């Protein structure tokens, strides 16, 4: 019967909550209260990337920490050389409604997708010398919100159909399907070892998935609204989420609960993007109030503010070597800060 | 590495020339978001004007129009609707023939969205003939509604049909006038699915939207 199924589910949730409460011996705040604060963080803009016609949704740094890719609603993927500000490639998209872009770790491929429900993989190392559609992955019944390369032949995508997918680029087939979310899966983050990944959806919950078996390992709750961003800690044992409730939260894989909440009284706008520094001490979050906030990830203190953008900050990413952080906003400009 | 940097400069110059051409093409094209229910008559309007998202291209008086359809998307329109915050207009099609209350709630959500502000809405009150050939129980206030003095009924129209259609139009316009503030405007039209004037109505509304935006830039309005 449905009623006994519901009561079994609620008693299981009560047992899980009791176990989490039992494991909550101490708070991270009262543990890091005795460490020195990071002080005022004064980042400045060094480069301003211009050329995009419309608002920008996604950017992704290359593993060389020099080249990056940006996706705009005019139908353009642009590869920027952040050192010299020059444009390397300009890829026109068949569908101008792009919401995500990814850079392959090898740098030979780029990915995009959006309202067309298609994950387009472009080859940047063609013999002829021009960028062409290497592959088109289809099968999602909802808009593509995020995509991340595992390697040159495997990709992971999050869609608005409440499911995630693991695709083999060579065969173009959806090798694995991750189901369980009850809302639009908005953000995706791969672990440093690329063995697990966290997905944040519009059901105010985050889920940890194993790549091999395609099953949900843990579910983390605590956010009051839709989760728009997610990012692993550099260690890989924890992650951070930003939600529409104007809060960021730090969840732990081993503790299976939330450790810290980053929010302020005067912040009433949702978070669109989050990222960690190289050491994980700083948490950078982009907000709807046109600004980015750098928080002390260990003390939940507002370390600094990045206030160079004129419109909504849609994305931000930190280089692999941690030299600089690039923010892309709806004002059609990218800004590199350090 | 002067030669390596020279290659980057020339490649950037080529890319910027292509981007200038693309910008010239892009600024001369008007993008419209077509919203409506499955039974509201949106599909037949699309057919007359001619999987994730559908495209229609049409030229009116040598002016290009780039119209989009929702396509294969879930009813959860909370997130992807933001992607159309910068379109020229949202053509919202409502079947006037309680789906009317659902359409009103959707229109209210679109109008009051923080990102859909500054975006104008062209209201197509479709299926006017079905309403004419077909309210008190679903809308009690209709008992105390009178036809506005500014109404311009088509000749040979039953006064009851005119009263009903203008009541629906005023019900939709109440939301628009509640929080208009002049940042965006609503354009209602009494249309039919097979009407050939819908294209002209959209073109005229786009002209008015562009003129009002230009006036706002000069603070004249």
């Amino acid at each position: 019967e449905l009623d006994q199924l519901r009561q079994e589910a609620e008693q299981l949730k009560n047992q899980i909550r009791d176990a989490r409460k039992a494991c909550a011996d101490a708070t991270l705040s009262q543990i890091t209260n005795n460490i020195d604060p990071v002080g005022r963080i004064q980042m400045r803009t060094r480069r301003t990337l211009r050329g995009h016609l419309a608002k920008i949704y996604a950017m992704h740094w290359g593993t060389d920490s020099r080249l990056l890719v940006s996706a705009s609603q005019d139908g353009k993927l642009i590869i920027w050389d952040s050192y010299t500000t020059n444009k390397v490639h300009a890829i026109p998209l068949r569908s101008s409604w792009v919401m995500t872009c990814a850079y392959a770790p090898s740098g030979n491929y780029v990915a995009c997708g959006g309202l067309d429900n298609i994950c387009s993989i472009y080859n940047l190392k063609t013999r002829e010398g021009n960028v062409r559609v290497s592959r088109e992955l289809a099968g999602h019944t909802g808009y593509l919100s995020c995509c991340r390369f595992l390697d040159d032949n495997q990709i992971v995508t999050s869609s608005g159909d409440t499911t995630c997918a693991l695709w083999d680029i060579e065969t173009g087939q959806q090798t694995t399907t991750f189901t369980g979310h009850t809302g639009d899966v908005m953000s995706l983050s791969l672990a440093p070892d690329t063995r697990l990944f966290v997905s944040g959806a519009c059901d105010a919950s985050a889920k940890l998935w194993d790549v091999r078996e395609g099953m949900c390992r843990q579910t983390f709750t605590g956010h009051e609204s839709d989760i728009n961003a997610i990012c692993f800690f550099p260690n890989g044992n924890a992650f951070a989420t930003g939600s529409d409730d104007a809060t960021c939260r730090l969840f732990d894989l081993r503790a299976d609960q939330e450790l810290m909440t980053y929010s302020h009284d005067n912040i009433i706008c949702g978070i669109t993007s989050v990222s960690f520094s190289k050491s994980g001490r700083l948490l950078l979050a982009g907000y709807d109030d046109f600004n980015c906030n750098v928080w002390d990830a260990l003390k939940a203190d507002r370390a600094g503010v990045l206030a160079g953008h004129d419109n909504r900050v849609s994305c931000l990413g930190v280089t692999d070597d941690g030299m600089a952080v690039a923010t892309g906003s709806w004002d059609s400009f990218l800004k590199i800060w350090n | 590495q002067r030669n390596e940097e020279k290659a980057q400069r020339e490649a950037n110059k080529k890319i910027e020339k292509q981007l200038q051409k693309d910008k010239q093409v892009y600024r001369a094209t008007h993008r419209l978001l077509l919203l409506g229910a499955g039974e509201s008559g949106k599909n037949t309007i699309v057919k007359q004007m001619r999987s994730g998202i559908f495209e229609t291209k049409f030229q009116v008086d040598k002016v290009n129009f780039h119209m989009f359809d929702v396509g294969a998307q879930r009813d959860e329109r909370r997130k992807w609707i933001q992607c159309f915050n910068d379109v020229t207009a949202i053509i919202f099609v409502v079947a006037s023939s309680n789906r009317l209350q659902a359409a009103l709630k959707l229109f209210d959500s679109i109008w009051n969205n923080k990102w859909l502000r500054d975006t104008s809405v062209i209201l197509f009150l479709n299926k006017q003939d079905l309403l004419a050939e077909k309210i008190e129980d679903y809308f009690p206030e209709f008992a105390r509604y009178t036809t506005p003095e500014d109404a311009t009924p088509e000749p040979g129209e039953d006064p009851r049909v005119t009263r009903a259609k203008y009541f629906i139009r005023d019900e939709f316009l109440r939301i628009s006038t509640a929080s208009g503030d002049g940042r965006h405007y609503c354009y209602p039209h009494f249309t039919c699915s097979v009407d050939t004037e819908n294209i002209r109505r959209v073109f005229n509304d786009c002209r008015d939207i562009i003129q009002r935006m230009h006036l706002r830039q000069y603070e004249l309005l």
Epitope: T162, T182, G183, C202, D203, A204, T221, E224, S225, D226, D244, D245, A246, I268, G270 | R74, D75, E76, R77, R78, I81, A102, K105, D108, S109, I110, W111, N112, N113, K114, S179
Partner: nanobody
Framework: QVQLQESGGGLVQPGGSLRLSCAAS????????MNWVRQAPGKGLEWVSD????????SYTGSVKGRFTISRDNAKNTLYLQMNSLKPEDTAVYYC?????????????????????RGQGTQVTV
């Protein structure tokens, strides 16, 4: 996590009255605008009533206007729908829906199927 629990409802003679309640947990109740929706047998979800954050702005659908009243207690983190003089077509499963985001006038997808911020619903039958 977000948890909305609806209590009340059942069998009642036509023209009767009863008070549906809903208790909310896992979020700040005073920051969210609340809705009452219903699903009739063989029909889709239909919006019924709407109350703002402070309760100043209140709206109803035309079918139940003048018979249903909606209220909220922010201190008790709950809301109530008192229905008077019921009719045979009011038999439905009533759900309480929370607006997806706080400090927003718009409220998207409350009546859409598979909505995360909605309760399990309680049955009301004449």
């Amino acid at each position: 996590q977000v948890q909305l629990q609806e209590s009340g409802g059942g069998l009642v003679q036509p023209g009767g009255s009863l008070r549906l309640s809903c208790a909310a947990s896992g979020f700040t109740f005073s920051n969210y605008k609340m809705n009452w929706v219903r699903q009739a047998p063989g029909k889709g979800l239909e919006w019924v009533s709407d109350i703002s954050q402070s309760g100043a702005s209140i709206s109803y659908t035309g079918s139940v206007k003048g018979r249903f009243t909606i209220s909220r207690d922010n201190a008790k983190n709950t809301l109530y729908l008192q229905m008077n003089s019921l009719k045979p077509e009011d038999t439905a499963v009533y759900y309480c829906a929370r607006c997806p985001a706080p400090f927003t006038r718009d409220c998207f997808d409350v009546t859409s199927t598979t909505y995360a911020y909605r309760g399990q619903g309680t049955q009301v039958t004449v």
